[PDB]
Design a protein around this ligand. Structure first.
Ligand SMILES: CCc1ccc(OC[C@@H](F)CO)c2occc12
Length: 104
């Protein structure tokens, strides 16, 4: 049903939990360090980038629209994600975003 990923503030995968493989067929090392945008269907990039701009400016859960994500075999699956951007309480800077990614 769902898996969790962590992203740098630019959208790069920096952590992928073990549930990702059963869902996307990628092992973690095929995603880590790559840009989330490389996997989006080009019809979804616009609204996903809009959520990107918004999750960086608030601590409230951002929920994406549905969007398509390219899996290892080239096909696309439909996801919906819940994002929380975490701010270092000391430095006051956002160090990563935690994305819970739900199938269809
Ligand atoms: C850096 C904020 C962020 C987190 C997660 C994203 O997508 C997750 C998918 F790649 C997994 O299905 C994002 O997309 C654009 C910005 C973005």
């Amino acid at each position: 049903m769902e898996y969790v990923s962590r992203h740098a503030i630019d959208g790069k995968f920096v952590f992928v939990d073990q549930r990702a493989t059963a869902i996307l067929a990628y092992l973690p090392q095929e995603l880590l360090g790559t840009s989330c945008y490389e996997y989006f269907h080009q019809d979804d990039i616009g609204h996903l980038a809009e959520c990107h701009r918004q999750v960086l400016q608030t601590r409230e859960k951002i929920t994406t629209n549905c969007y398509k994500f390219k899996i290892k075999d080239g096909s696309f699956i439909t996801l919906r994600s819940r994002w929380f951007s975490f701010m270092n309480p000391w430095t006051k800077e956002v160090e990563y975003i935690v994305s819970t990614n739900t199938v269809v």
